[PDB]
Amino acid sequence: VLLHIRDVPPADQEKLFIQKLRQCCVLFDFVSDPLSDLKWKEVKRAALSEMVEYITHNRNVITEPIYPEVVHMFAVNMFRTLPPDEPTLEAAWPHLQLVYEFFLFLESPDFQPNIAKKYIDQKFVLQLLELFDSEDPRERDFLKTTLHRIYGKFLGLRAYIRKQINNIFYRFIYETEHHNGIAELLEILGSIINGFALPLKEEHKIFLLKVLLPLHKVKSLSVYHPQLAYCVVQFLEKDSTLTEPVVMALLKYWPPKEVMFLNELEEILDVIEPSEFVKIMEPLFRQLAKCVSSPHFQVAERALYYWNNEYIMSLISDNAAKILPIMFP
Template sequence: ILSKLVELFVVDDFRERDYLKAILHRLYSRLLDSRTFIRCHIQLTLENAAYDTPEFHHAGVASLLQVMCAIVNGYAIPIRQDHVAFLSSALIPLHRVRHLGLILKPLQACMITYLEKEASLAETVLLGMFKYWPRIDSAKEALMLDELREILMYTNQSVVKRIAPQIFSHIGECMCSESSVVAEK
């Protein structure tokens, strides 16, 4: 039943998705033994979305990300390794989707919630973003520049110093972009 509940997030009606979000979050908070199963199924759904499988539904992914943001907010500190693996295998690869703008706000909120819990994950997040950095889609590149700015606000100076060459390399490429929107950002 729980797996079917996660699969229902592909519906077009936002009211149904809102009810599903509330139900899934309530079940997650009450069914302690099923939390791992719920997270694994959400992870599988987000991984499928990251690789643009046919059942990918932008609004459903955005709703699942909102649920995940609430779940991540409840994580104990330090964050367990399986939660870090979720970040690396399910959330960061979502930056590669073609229609990033439709899911960016809840995705960014999820990433920032992780960083608020454990700032040491900033390097993982930034290097993951650079891995999926767009090369020809200037609209997506502008969105990711905005996200980069937000993520850097939650990043320690020591992490920034460690990966400064990669950061400045991407910023330099953006400054030389043929797109005026990207170059100005």
């Protein structure tokens, strides 16, 4: 052997359960000799697979002692230093995917976060966040959800996380360092944003203006843009007041991928208060009248689909006076 001596749990006890997590800390080489310890690799694979089918299918098996055992295990496998266009994939996915799966334990009905709070602390949550720079998408996918759960269950870390994400975006926009998991992080925020309490704390108001808007200006914007748009329209929905510098910001940061802008805008228009619309109708339309002409074809068509919007066409009706002359006659 090379990881002790165990087997499926018919026996029923938890001590066995402990030992499996514990020999599942035995790490393997999937990189610098993929062909090593294939029999052992499969064992570890099966064990994780076992533990998963276990924790989902049979209640009151999560229990005070195992919390640190589970965390410790997730710790020992996931927290590692990462390698560096088309992506690199985690050679070790065959293990690491199940460690991802298994840890979602987070979602088991009898997860008591009160016991967990002991082990799923800031030191952890950090190195979790550190892993968002993974080139491998299907890993990021896992982290996105995982970290989501942790936020929604540990009120205790809600604070800390927010700061840490801030400090990523800030370093990303300003400190110029590329940070590689921005579309996932951004999808998180959308749901943190949706849930924001009223009135918007001026801090949130500021993060909009100092972090969320500058993202539009970056070169890779297309790569994370859908999710960026959501955060924006989620703001403009929580407080209808921020429309004024939001739309302006957008028109400044405007160009091709004109289309994405065209999406965000309609999605913005969909939520716009009439009194707030007037604030920007003039500059907005000058811009839009350009797009209907925009030689880039699919730009124009997209600009056209605005006129099919019943609300948008009401807003124009209400103001056809000032808007309509922004076409010819």
